[model samples]
Target: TLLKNKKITIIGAGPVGLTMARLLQQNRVDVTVYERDKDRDARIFGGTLDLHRDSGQEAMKRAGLLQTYYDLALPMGVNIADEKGNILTTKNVKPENRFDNPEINRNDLRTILLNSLQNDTVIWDRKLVTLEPDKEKWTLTFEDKPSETADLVIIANGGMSKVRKFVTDTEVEETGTFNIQADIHQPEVNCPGFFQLCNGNRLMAAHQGNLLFANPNNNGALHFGISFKTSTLVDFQDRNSVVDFLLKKFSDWDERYKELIRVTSSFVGLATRIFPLGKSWKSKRPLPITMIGDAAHLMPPFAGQGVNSGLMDALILSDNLTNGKFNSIEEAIENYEQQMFAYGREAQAESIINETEMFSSDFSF
Candidate 1:
């Protein structure tokens, strides 16, 4: 086995990170996952995600959660509509009808991965602030308390990851797109027409240089996000300002559009950003400090390829590391990084196109 008696540290409890831990653990690799969120509820702060075949589905298969993921996938919520309540597409059949993008709530996906592990696998409430390197050992400091030194560290945090500087000095710029997001339970009862417009599977409506989309959550709720093409960035940390900004942006939109903002009890604003791919990352030492997923490749969400690409990283890395297909860890990591860099760069470029299509004047059907 690749990790016969190895102790690995995985930072970030996202699907890619969690899936990587599980993949390694199944091969008897001891892993410790560090998360910044206070708990599981704190992770439930994102919209619904539809997993594509390559990343999400492939990772589930490797981690042996394929059947469970399919069972939890809400395939009935994939609807496309316009801002004026016009249904552009409604799926009914199986293959073309359903496709490979199985939908699941982002929280549900995270929860299943988090719950799969046994007692205390995840170290919660610890926010990583900085890292200190001492020869072979590196110290990681959280928001409070002492620091942790690990033999090897896997940085799988996310797009806004702080640990990336250790591995790469590339600067990521924020795209002019921001999401004003909310979640409402029993959306059909809360917003009947709006829910029906998407036919309960999915909904993507773009008009007036703005896009509003909603999908079904595992909790029979609607996770909706209003995408605004703004010159300004999203300030999710400032709750009051986020709400005010959403209100101002959607002021003239229809009631269906406004209802999402009105009925939402909780709100957050996220600024979309991207790190150009094919850039140089630090390979200065054999300290075993490497990154995967968003830390390796952060980009805009227009193409819906983020999570899938991250999962692919986990699978490809795990296979090379533990499968003995490679001669050395250095070889395996280099291979993984090279492949990841190429794929990530290509995907990031596609996302730029998707960003244009998302807000394009020709966006119809």
Candidate 2:
């Protein structure tokens, strides 16, 4: 009843934001999702993600999309290899756990969420630039577009969201480590040796304190990331420089490792930076507005808890808002924030521990 007849807007059409919209709409709430991508067909470059049962899948079930996720996801195994491409260990999923956390492409997951939404639920290419209070509502400014008003606004963008300052004063800090990601297209013909080493699953290798993680099924391409601890950040202008840097770093390792970097497409390598974890904000505005996902808690990708934790935010927040247990919207938001902070801190701690060990001198898979 608190959100009745309210104009709700959610920024960033990522898995968290889209899932937020889906749940809110299913509750008969009016909502719209604004995305920065040009359209639905835009490429989302990232490795596949496995939705954990208690967090991501639970949220999907709340939104009535759990079966769709299972239908579209792929079950994968793990292979641990040495520097010479020799498999040291392999672990296949048990039959009971096959559907527990299946891998799904980022784009495919987005499409699944998008199709379940109502017509014109998302407005594309609307990059939000500013947000200001306008009477009882908030005015949203976008890039090369007119402004709009909403009774409630939710920031679900990634960690570097420009609107973060409006909700929190928490500063994002570097984690003293960085990752370079590369995608090897047509791996069967381009990088068959490394592809075969993966064994149609996830492959992990660590040598001399540098870690390499590779996934064979990122939408028909091989997606991998090379991570290490460093005091300084390096920027590459082009693909040649990125490949050269990676090759030099792993020069003494193995030829197969360099082969994976060699066949990587030009300009496909990305340098990832980490930010602070489980940050919170205090707002005294008259209308209800809040943030979710990385905007509230940003951490390294070591433990793979980033997206799962964000989805949990959506689940709890939506439940509190529509459950009819809270007397006011502010009460619902406060309860959600309390529970989010509790679990978000735990997830952040796990990610930090994993990151520290992964970059240590004697870490192993």
Superposed by TM-score, candidate 2 places the C-alpha of residue 290 at a distance from the truth, in angstroms, of 0.8
For 1-365, candidate 2 gives per-residue lDDT tens digits of 87999999999999999999999999999999999999999989878888888999999999898999999999999999888788989887778879888999999999989998998999999999998887799899999988889998989988888786666777777777777776778888888888888878799988887889999888788889888776422355566777777887898767878888888875443334444544456657556878889877888888999899999999999999999999988888889888988988889888989888877888876
CA lDDT, candidate 1, residue 351? 90
Query: Which ranges of candidate 2 are over 4 A from the true structure?
Result: 232-235, 267-280
Estimate candidate 2's alpha-carbon lDDT, on a 0 to 1 scale.
0.85
Cα error, candidate 2, residue 182 (Å): 1.9
Please tell me which predicted candidate would have the highest lDDT against the true structure.
Answer: 2
Report the backbone clash tally of model 1. Answer: 9
Q: Rate the local accuracy (lDDT) of all candidates.
A: 0.77, 0.85
Candidate with best TM-score: 2
Residue 142 displacement (Å), model 1: 2.2
Error of 1 at 283 (Å): 3.1
